[PDB]
Amino acid sequence: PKEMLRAQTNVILLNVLKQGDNYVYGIIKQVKEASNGEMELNEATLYTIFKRLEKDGIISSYWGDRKYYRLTEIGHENMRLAFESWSRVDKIIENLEA
Amino acid sequence: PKEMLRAQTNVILLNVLKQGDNYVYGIIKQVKEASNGEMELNEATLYTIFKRLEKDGIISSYWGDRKYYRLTEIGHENMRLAFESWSRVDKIIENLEA
Numbered sequence: 001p002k003e004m005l006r007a008q009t010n011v012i013l014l015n016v017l018k019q020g021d022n023y024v025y026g027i028i029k030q031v032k033e034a035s036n037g038e039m040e041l042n043e044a045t046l047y048t049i050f051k052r053l054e055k056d057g058i059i060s061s062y063w064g065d066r067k068y069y070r071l072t073e074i075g076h077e078n079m080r081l082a083f084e085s086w087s088r089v090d091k092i093i094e095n096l097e098a
Numbered sequence: 099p100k101e102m103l104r105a106q107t108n109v110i111l112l113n114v115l116k117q118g119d120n121y122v123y124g125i126i127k128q129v130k131e132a133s134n135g136e137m138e139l140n141e142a143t144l145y146t147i148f149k150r151l152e153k154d155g156i157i158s159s160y161w162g163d164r165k166y167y168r169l170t171e172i173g174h175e176n177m178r179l180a181f182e183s184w185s186r187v188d189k190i191i192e193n194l195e196a
């Protein structure tokens with residue numbers, strides 16, 4: 001299911017960035033560690049996703065003193081809205097089971 | 099965010115069907131109750147989503163002795179796979195926070 005994995009990777013990448021500004025290799029390390037090894041992102045997958053997020057204003061980038069990525073203001077608020085509504089969804093689903 | 103609401107509604111509808119075969123009005127009642135009133139689905143929204151799920155083999159339909167909908171075999175397994183991987187995602191996200 002290609003576009004569910006895509007969605008999953010998006011959420012994860014945004015959450016890494018939420019923890020702090022980071023660069024591609026740093027992100028890939030953090031995701032591999034937090035996933036107990038089960039998830040090893042390809043450098044190129046990150047460039048594809050980051051090209052799209054930048055265009056949509058959700059993230060921005062800049063150079064160290066190596067390319068760093070940053071969650072924008074829009075990006076933070078979009079994450080908050082997403083977490084809020086998906087949490088409603090999770091409780092609705094909880095009420096359907098019992 | 100049109101296509102996130104769409105995704106949310108999909109998950110909810112599939113979970114209703116997971117609880118048991120149901121018909122459009124019954125589903126809408128159950129979702130409104132489980133959502134403490136915050137979520138009132140339109141009859142037409144359900145037809146749009148159910149047309150797509152049927153085509154993809156995820157659900158099927160039949161008449162009572164009124165149209166009933168049913169999660170297919172594929173449908174159940176797809177739900178299980180989705181719940182499993184999103185649960186990995188949730189734990190990965192948990193490790194990134196602390």
Ligand SMILES: Cc1cc2nc3c(=O)[nH]c(=O)nc-3n(C[C@H](O)[C@H](O)[C@H](O)CO)c2cc1C
Binds near residue numbers: 109184
């Ligand atoms: C920020 C966030 C975004 C999510 N996005 C999706 C999604 O696009 N599709 C999906 O099926 N589940 C998503 N989920 C998980 C969802 O709440 C649910 O656990 C699974 O969809 C299966 O129940 C998301 C969860 C979080 C916390």
